[PDB]
């Protein structure tokens, strides 16, 4: 024992200190991991929001399935022969 083993002991603790509080240690890993985890979750929603709107816009050009929904909903106009009903409270 003496210093033949203690000199090699405190260095391990300095590595345990520098493992958690290092420049890229455990704390920075956990800190960055949470930042990456939350950010990519948002980009999933943002992409899902854009992809849905991109699909909507991709329909109004050369297609009439989505344009007919805009004409029905916002202009209240129907096709010839369809008996239009309405609900009043």
């Amino acid at each position: 024992m003496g210093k033949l083993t203690l000199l090699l002991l405190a260095i391990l603790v300095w590595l345990q200190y520098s493992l958690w509080f290092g420049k890229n240690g455990i704390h920075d890993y956990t800190r960055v991991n949470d930042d990456v985890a939350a950010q990519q979750a948002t980009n999933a929603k943002l992409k899902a929001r854009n992809d849905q709107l991109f699909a909507a816009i991709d329909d109004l050009n050369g297609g009439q399935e989505a344009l007919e929904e805009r004409a029905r909903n916002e202009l209240s106009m129907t096709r010839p022969g369809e008996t239009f009903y309405r609900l009043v409270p």
Binding site: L67, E74, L75, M77, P80, R86, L87, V88, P89
Partner: peptide, 24 residues
């Protein structure tokens, strides 16, 4: 531009006579 293509697709503006109403 939505209405001018709607009437091109044989659509008809909402008429109040031909409009059936229901109460909750």
């Amino acid at each position: 531009r939505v209405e001018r293509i709607a009437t091109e697709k044989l659509q008809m503006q909402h008429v109040d006579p031909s409009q059936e109403n229901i109460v909750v």
